[PDB]
């Protein structure tokens, strides 16, 4: 979906149509307020730069735990969620309860989904990892028992269940890393719906300003008091590239955790 260059701004704009969406107001009981922090903590200092000035957004409560076991539900509609890059689906259970989930690929209104041990192997069903079939592709993987999905939630993300022993299951993450997961944890069958997210193009600075991103200033343009890459009578790049606080930026590993080293089987060749 390219835009005709009627203006210098409209020349390099690419968007996704996805006309199958709801195109309406979201479910009111499942919507709560949400405000912009501006990248500042309770002390008032800027802890994360390049954040501020976006569009007003409400928060849609997505049910990540899916603890309603053995109750079949039907898909009502697919909606647009500004809080994430994926699409959401509205489910209606037998008793009449309404909940929001992460819509897998191809899920449309009228589909039947269950979250239990005896659930069949269909896209959108949540099952423990031991009941999962070997070699399949999963999403919304759970790490701690009972907390809810924490992995493969972005648009188009998916993991593969390589193998499972008696006590653990081996999965390969999207980054290329193989790690161990408890066999009691749960996952969902299929891949996340929104797949054409990376194919979009903003086209102008206005879109980045709409999405709540502030301009980035290179360290070279700053003064010696501001950035280590400061000073010089012209365009100069004096020292090894570092962060504004003195940390190396090229090929320097920053992982320091020692508590969960046993889980990672093979690294992503970092």
Considering only residues 54-73, where is the footprint of RNA by CB under 7 A?
Answer: 59, 61-62
Residue 56 in contact with residue 212, Cβ under 8 Å?
no
Q: What span, in angstroms and rounded, lies between the C-alpha atoms of 176 and 269?
A: 8
Q: Which of 1, 7, 67, 83 binds RNA (CB under 7 A)?
A: 83
Number of helices (H), then strands (E), in the chain: 1, 15
The answer to the question of residue 166 lying near RNA (CB under 7 A) is: no
Considering only residues 209-228, where is the footprint of RNA by CB under 7 A?
Answer: 213, 215-221, 227
Question: Shortest distance, CB of residue 3 to Mg ion, whole angstroms?
Answer: 21
The answer to the question of residue 101 lying near RNA (CB under 7 A) is: no
Residue 100 in contact with residue 58, Cβ under 8 Å?
no
Considering only residues 120-139, where is the footprint of Mg ion by CB under 5 A?
Answer: none
Of 61 and 71, which has the nearer Cβ to RNA? 61
Of 216 and 256, which has the nearer Cβ to Mg ion? 216
Among 168, 93, 170, 166, residue whose Cα is nearest residue 138: 170
The answer to the question of residue 107 lying near RNA (CB under 7 A) is: no
**Which pair of tokens denotes residue 66?**
């899916």
What separation in angstroms does the CA of 137 have from each of 14, 47, 157, 159? 30, 37, 10, 6
Among 50, 97, 55, 111, residue whose Cα is nearest residue 80: 55
Of 6 and 175, which has the nearer Cβ to RNA? 175
Q: Which of 55, 65, 108, 248 binds RNA (CB under 7 A)?
A: 248
Q: Which of 26, 30, 208, 231 binds RNA (CB under 7 A)?
A: 208
Give the H/E segment covering residue 89. strand 88-93
Give the strand pairing for 141-142 and 168-172. unpaired
Q: Tell me how many degrees the CA angle 234-235-239 measures, rounded to the nearest 5.
A: 115
Q: Which of 5, 53, 106, 238 binds Mg ion (CB under 5 A)?
A: 238
Q: What span, in angstroms and rounded, lies between the C-alpha atoms of 266 and 175?
A: 11
The answer to the question of residue 237 lying near RNA (CB under 7 A) is: yes
Total residues interacting with RNA, rule: CB under 7 A = 87
Residue 163 interacting partner from RNA, Mg ion, none (CB closer than 5 to 8 Å by kind): none
Q: What span, in angstroms and rounded, lies between the C-alpha atoms of 267 and 249?
A: 20
The answer to the question of residue 232 lying near Mg ion (CB under 5 A) is: yes
Stretch that binds RNA, among 15-23, 34-42, 117-125, 181-189 (CB under 7 A): 34-42
The answer to the question of residue 231 lying near Mg ion (CB under 5 A) is: yes
The answer to the question of residue 211 lying near Mg ion (CB under 5 A) is: no
Residue 186 interacting partner from RNA, Mg ion, none (CB closer than 5 to 8 Å by kind): none
Q: Under the rule (CB under 5 A), what is the footprint of Mg ion?
A: 50, 231-232, 236, 238
């Amino acid at each position: 979906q390219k835009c005709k260059p009627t203006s210098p701004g409209r020349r390099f704009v690419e968007k996704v149509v996805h006309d199958h969406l709801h195109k309406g107001a979201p479910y009111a009981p499942l919507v709560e307020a949400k405000k912009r922090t501006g990248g500042r903590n309770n002390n008032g200092h800027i802890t994360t730069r390049h954040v501020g000035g976006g569009h007003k957004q409400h928060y849609r409560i997505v049910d990540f735990k899916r603890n309603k076991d053995g109750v079949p539900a039907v898909v009502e509609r697919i909606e647009y969620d500004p809080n994430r890059t994926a699409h959401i689906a509205l489910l209606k259970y037998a008793d009449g309860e309404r909940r929001y989930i992460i819509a897998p690929k191809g899920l449309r209104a009228g589909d039947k989904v269950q979250s239990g041990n005896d659930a069949p192997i269909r896209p959108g069903n949540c099952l423990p990892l031991r009941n999962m079939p070997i070699g399949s592709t999963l999403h919304n993987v759970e790490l701690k028992i009972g907390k809810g999905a924490q992995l493969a939630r972005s648009a188009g993300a998916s993991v593969q269940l390589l193998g499972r022993d008696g006590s653990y299951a081996i999965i390969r993450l999207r980054s290329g890393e193989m790690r161990k997961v408890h066999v009691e944890c749960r996952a969902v069958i299929g891949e996340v719906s929104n797949q054409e997210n990376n194919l979009r193009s903003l086209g102008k600075a206005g879109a980045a300003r709409w999405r709540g991103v502030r301009p980035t200033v290179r360290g070279m343009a700053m003064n010696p008091i501001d950035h280590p890459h400061g000073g010089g009578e012209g365009r100069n790049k004096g020292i090894q590239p570092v962060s504004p606080w003195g940390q190396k930026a090229k090929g320097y590993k920053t992982r320091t955790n020692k508590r969960t080293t046993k889980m990672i089987i093979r690294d992503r060749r970092v």
